[PDB]
Scaffold this active site. Structure first.
Site, PDB file in Angstrom:
ATOM      1  N   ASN A   1      46.521  33.073  27.994  1.00 52.94           N
ATOM      2  CA  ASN A   1      45.272  33.266  27.285  1.00 52.94           C
ATOM      3  C   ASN A   1      45.428  32.800  25.863  1.00 52.94           C
ATOM      4  O   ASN A   1      46.537  32.666  25.357  1.00 52.94           O
ATOM      5  CB  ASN A   1      44.861  34.725  27.301  1.00 52.94           C
ATOM      6  CG  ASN A   1      44.684  35.230  28.681  1.00 52.94           C
ATOM      7  OD1 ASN A   1      44.102  34.553  29.501  1.00 52.94           O
ATOM      8  ND2 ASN A   1      45.188  36.394  28.955  1.00 52.94           N
TER       9      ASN A   1
ATOM     10  N   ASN B   1      45.886  40.861  32.913  1.00 51.45           N
ATOM     11  CA  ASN B   1      46.415  40.324  31.687  1.00 51.45           C
ATOM     12  C   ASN B   1      47.422  41.269  31.076  1.00 51.45           C
ATOM     13  O   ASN B   1      47.393  42.483  31.256  1.00 51.45           O
ATOM     14  CB  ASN B   1      45.294  40.013  30.701  1.00 51.45           C
ATOM     15  CG  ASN B   1      44.734  41.219  30.056  1.00 51.45           C
ATOM     16  OD1 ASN B   1      45.390  41.854  29.289  1.00 51.45           O
ATOM     17  ND2 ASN B   1      43.476  41.514  30.336  1.00 51.45           N
TER      18      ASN B   1
ATOM     19  N   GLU C   1      39.970  34.007  40.467  1.00 55.59           N
ATOM     20  CA  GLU C   1      41.002  34.241  39.471  1.00 55.59           C
ATOM     21  C   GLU C   1      42.255  33.452  39.767  1.00 55.59           C
ATOM     22  O   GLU C   1      42.844  32.870  38.864  1.00 55.59           O
ATOM     23  CB  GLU C   1      41.350  35.719  39.384  1.00 55.59           C
ATOM     24  CG  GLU C   1      40.271  36.567  38.821  1.00 55.59           C
ATOM     25  CD  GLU C   1      40.046  36.284  37.348  1.00 55.59           C
ATOM     26  OE1 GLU C   1      40.657  35.363  36.790  1.00 55.59           O
ATOM     27  OE2 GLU C   1      39.198  36.938  36.760  1.00 55.59           O
TER      28      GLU C   1
ATOM     29  N   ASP D   1      45.061  34.337  23.239  1.00 51.94           N
ATOM     30  CA  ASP D   1      45.681  35.286  22.333  1.00 51.94           C
ATOM     31  C   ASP D   1      47.173  35.400  22.572  1.00 51.94           C
ATOM     32  O   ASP D   1      47.835  36.198  21.918  1.00 51.94           O
ATOM     33  CB  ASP D   1      45.022  36.655  22.460  1.00 51.94           C
ATOM     34  CG  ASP D   1      45.347  37.325  23.744  1.00 51.94           C
ATOM     35  OD1 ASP D   1      45.775  36.649  24.685  1.00 51.94           O
ATOM     36  OD2 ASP D   1      45.168  38.540  23.820  1.00 51.94           O
TER      37      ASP D   1
ATOM     38  N   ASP E   1      47.815  36.130  32.064  1.00 54.16           N
ATOM     39  CA  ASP E   1      47.209  36.763  33.220  1.00 54.16           C
ATOM     40  C   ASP E   1      48.101  36.483  34.410  1.00 54.16           C
ATOM     41  O   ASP E   1      48.625  35.387  34.544  1.00 54.16           O
ATOM     42  CB  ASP E   1      45.843  36.188  33.472  1.00 54.16           C
ATOM     43  CG  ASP E   1      45.088  36.017  32.223  1.00 54.16           C
ATOM     44  OD1 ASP E   1      44.838  37.034  31.605  1.00 54.16           O
ATOM     45  OD2 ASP E   1      44.782  34.851  31.835  1.00 54.16           O
TER      46      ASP E   1
ATOM     47  N   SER F   1      48.500  36.384  25.388  1.00 47.23           N
ATOM     48  CA  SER F   1      48.752  37.134  26.577  1.00 47.23           C
ATOM     49  C   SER F   1      48.670  36.198  27.755  1.00 47.23           C
ATOM     50  O   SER F   1      48.243  35.048  27.653  1.00 47.23           O
ATOM     51  CB  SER F   1      47.762  38.275  26.721  1.00 47.23           C
ATOM     52  OG  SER F   1      46.436  37.790  26.859  1.00 47.23           O
TER      53      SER F   1
END
Ligand SMILES: CC(=O)N[C@@H]1[C@@H](O)[C@H](O[C@@H]2O[C@H](CO)[C@@H](O)[C@H](O)[C@H]2NC(C)=O)[C@@H](CO)O[C@@H]1O
Ligand SMILES: [Cl-]
Ligand SMILES: [Cl-]
Ligand SMILES: [Cl-]
Ligand SMILES: [Cl-]
Ligand SMILES: [Cl-]
Ligand code: NA
Ligand code: NA
Length: 129
Positions: A46, A59, A35, A48, A52, A50
């Site tokens: 991301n 997120n 990650e 959308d 992380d 958002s």
């Protein structure tokens, strides 16, 4: 902070992640590796909108508040910036909520794609734990 592998393993173990919800410690270390490359300051946006955050790339759509993910939740009840701390407590405590939520570690895309079904114990090999 960029953790060493075993350093992070040890920190995660101290914070109760070893076998948390049945996920051996190597799962968590593997997830963090892929990650965030063990970097607590990692952020990624991301599709959308958002973001992380942190070593486990938690997120802001669901888990933390970053003030810029409208309509999102903050289920870990933390500012997302808390997840960037060199102190992984907030990330671990949030991860514990996430992994408890019924989907296990599949919440972590990198874990699903790169750790799940692999020999994750390799990630804690050689570590003093
Ligand atoms: C526990 C956690 O937060 N995991 C992150 C995933 O949530 C990220 O996946 C992305 O999550 C956003 C918000 O839910 C989704 O909109 C987006 O589709 C999803 N991306 C993918 C490829 O599934 C993931 C992004 O790398 O990072 C953590 O695993
Ligand atoms: Cl490494
Ligand atoms: Cl393991
Ligand atoms: Cl927000
Ligand atoms: Cl810590
Ligand atoms: Cl599970
Ligand atoms: Na990610
Ligand atoms: Na949020």
């Amino acid at each position: 902070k960029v953790f060493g592998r075993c350093e992070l393993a040890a920190a995660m173990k101290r914070h109760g992640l070893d076998n948390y919800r049945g996920y051996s410690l190597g799962n968590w270390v593997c997830a963090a590796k892929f990650e965030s490359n063990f970097n607590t300051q990692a952020t990624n946006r991301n599709t959308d909108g958002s973001t992380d955050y942190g070593i486990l790339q938690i997120n802001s759509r669901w888990w933390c508040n970053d003030g810029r993910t409208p309509g999102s939740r903050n289920l870990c009840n933390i500012p997302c910036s808390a997840l960037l701390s060199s102190d992984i407590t907030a990330s671990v405590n949030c991860a514990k909520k996430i992994v408890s939520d019924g989907n296990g570690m599949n919440a972590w895309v990198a874990w699903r794609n790169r750790c799940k079904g692999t020999d994750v114990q390799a990630w804690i090999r050689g570590c003093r734990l």
